[PDB]
Ligand binder design. Structure first.
Ligand SMILES: COC(=O)N(CC(=O)O)Cc1cccc(OCc2nc(-c3ccc(Cl)cc3)oc2C)c1
Ligand SMILES: COC(=O)N(CC(=O)O)Cc1cccc(OCc2nc(-c3ccc(Cl)cc3)oc2C)c1
Lengths: 264, 271
């Protein structure tokens, strides 16, 4: 045993994952079963059901129904950004880094990470919203007017492909941690150590997937591709967001998310 | 007041003569298709969702004589054509059965058909589709939309746009009585280029359009504006077909193992 060091680290990240994230694949897959355990979610398929949801599920009414979704989306992503930061701090090594390195990894990582975890609450028909109490159809999102329907579709594409890997929360913890702890991110200060720290989380991820998915020994290689597809997905997302802000008159970009995009 | 007059018994006759012609000449219809999809029909469809079930399908559904060893995308491509060629035939027989259609100039019979057939195929294709996939092989098969997306460019760009159409179209909750009339109005279009007796064909559409109007008002008095909604769909199909005409040519012009059926070639020549 020298890897007894590593098997440890894997639980430390995954505990941090279970702690700092209210929404997880195992919880999300149980909800959408039909083995609902209590009440099932509430489905949104159009207006009527949307505005019944905007009643019972949120805290708006003045505005068009497209921007309601657009704004609601940011409420969720900001919460998640917060959860992601608390999770980043609970990664061994992350705290040790320059303050301005802790901010940069987080800047370029959070979205790649949001969309990877977003797959957990998506299937082909829709996604789990409002803390898991709601569910909005993919169809409904596509049957919204341009350019707002071009928003969510590409993420569904990603998720279907992603959930085909049939990863679990233990895999997703390490995977997400490999996304945050990335040495590519422009403007890093201690580039060499972030890399040594990456190559370390990458190692445990590789071996974990080999214990958990012996049935596909090439899963890790495939996650490195998904990591690639995520960076493009985010670049793509950056622009669809820019555009909607610089055209659509009632489009309100939260100042935190604005900053994240600043100099994308 | 008044019982039913024969100026409008002529109309329920038309909507009646057309509907039967539709049942006579189309092997697949919306009533059949939904029964097959609910699994309330009795060895149900066979799901295709990967390479294995694709290949193990062609074995027990179509074995390929002159295709056995091609790629996987080009199989679907060719497979698709067998179905549409079989549909054009069914569409032509159905067109011969529309009152007035046989009476038209022989060239006019084939021009209305040239421009109508794809508009009608995709309109009717909606019957065999849901959000997940579509019925294939005379009903006995089923292929995931998912799987059709999970092919490469530009092959996976073919079938998606028709799923967009169909989901919106099926939301109109139309039935075979409506579709029969709608298809007839598609074929009988006074709009199509190079027509030889444009005035009579105009008049002919107008009659079929008028029957469709009142039939929709009867069978769907809950959406009194179903008819206009359907006029929009005609438009949506013209462009769906147009876009489709160009992705086919691309796939012909580029993809070196993409054969276009010679009947379909002729059809496409000039759109
Ligand atoms: C611009 O919006 C986005 O596409 N995103 C937010 C961002 O850029 O920060 C991406 C994104 C990230 C995470 C989740 C997300 O969508 C969640 C989400 N939540 C709703 C919604 C609408 C009404 C009610 Cl009552 C409840 C929920 O819709 C959606 C798509 C969307
Ligand atoms: C070029 O092919 C096409 O996209 N089309 C044909 C054409 O243009 O004439 C459009 C089209 C028209 C009508 C139906 C259609 O889809 C039927 C269809 N049938 C299959 C298939 C594949 C393997 C097996 Cl074993 C069985 C069936 O796939 C598809 C899409 C597709």
């Amino acid at each position: 045993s020298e890897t007894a060091d590593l098997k440890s680290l894997a639980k430390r990240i995954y505990e941090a994952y279970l702690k700092n994230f209210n929404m997880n694949k195992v919880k999300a897959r149980v909800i959408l079963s039909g083995k609902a355990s209590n009440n099932p979610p509430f489905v949104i398929h159009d207006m009527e059901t949307l505005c019944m949801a905007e009643k019972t599920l949120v805290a708006i009414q003045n505005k068009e129904a497209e921007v309601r979704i657009f704004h609601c989306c940011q409420c969720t992503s900001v919460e998640t950004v917060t959860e992601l930061t608390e999770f980043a701090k609970a990664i061994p090594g992350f705290a040790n880094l320059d303050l301005n390195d802790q901010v940069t990894l987080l800047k370029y990582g959070v979205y790649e990470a949001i969309f990877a975890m977003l797959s957990s609450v998506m299937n082909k028909d829709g996604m789990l919203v409002a803390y898991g109490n709601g569910f909005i159809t993919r169809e409904f999102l596509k049957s919204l007017r341009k350019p707002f329907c071009d928003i969510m579709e590409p993420k569904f594409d990603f998720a279907m492909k992603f959930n085909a890997l049939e990863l679990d929360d233990s895999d997703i913890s390490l995977f997400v941690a490999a996304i945050i702890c990335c040495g590519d991110r422009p403007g890093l200060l201690n580039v060499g150590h972030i890399e040594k720290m990456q190559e370390g989380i990458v190692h445990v991820l590789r071996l974990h997937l080999q214990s958990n998915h012996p049935d596909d020994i090439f899963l890790f290689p495939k996650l490195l591709q998904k990591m690639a597809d995520l960076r493009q997905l985010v670049t793509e997302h950056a622009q669809l967001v820019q555009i909607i802000k610089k055209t659509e008159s009632d489009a309100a970009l939260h100042p935190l998310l604005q900053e994240i995009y600043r100099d994308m």
